[PDB]
Amino acid sequence: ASEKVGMNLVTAQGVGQSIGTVVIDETEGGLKFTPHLKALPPGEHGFHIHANGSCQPAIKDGQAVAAEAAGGHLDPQNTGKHEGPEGQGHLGDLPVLVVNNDGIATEPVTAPRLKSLDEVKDKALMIHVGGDNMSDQPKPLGGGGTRYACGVIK
């Protein structure tokens, strides 16, 4: 079973344009991700699910949060540490969205972290500025807590 999640760019103003969806397709090895996005910085980008579904910013002390109405990366009970190479953390954490040198991603990959669209039908996807393996600096993901795009599942 499958759902085509339309992701828009986000950058402290809130929802921008789109440049790609990602198709989510559930299987017995979980959520198969197949991206089709252009116009990103042509590296590698962390992939999360977030606690609410809302690609919208917050404003406080004369300054804007990138996009955060979606909540944290689905972080109910833990310590603050992120799910990764050792220990334990949040269940909304997923393998890194590789992009080719020309700024386009297509990699058919899978997250066994969840195994039906019914597990995400109230949430957002989020394409994160860094890849996603660290908790071990005074800010998590090595500072990669920022994001280029978001998409509410519908």
Residue 48 sits in the site that holds Cu ion (CB under 5 A): yes
Q: Choosing among Zn ion, Cu ion, none, which partner's interface includes residue 82 (Cβ < 5 to 8 Å by kind)?
A: Zn ion
Q: Which of 73, 123, 128, 147 binds Zn ion (CB under 5 A)?
A: 73
End-to-end CA distance of the chain: 14
Q: Which amino acid is at 87?
A: G
DSSP β-ladder status, 93-98 and 63-64: unpaired
- Contact with Zn ion (CB under 5 A): which of 50, 82, 123, 128? 82
Does 128 bind Zn ion (CB under 5 A)? Our answer is no
Rounded (5°) CA angle 19-28-99: 25
Question: How much helix, strand and coil, in percent to the nearest 5, is found in the chain?
Answer: 5, 40, 55
Q: Contact letters (x/-) for Cu ion, 70-109, by CB under 5 A?
A: ---x------------------------------------
Tell me, what DSSP letter sits at residue 64? E
Q: Which is nearer to Zn ion, 26 or 93 (CB)?
A: 93
45 binds Cu ion (CB under 5 A): no
The site for Zn ion (CB under 5 A) is made up of 73, 82, 90, 93
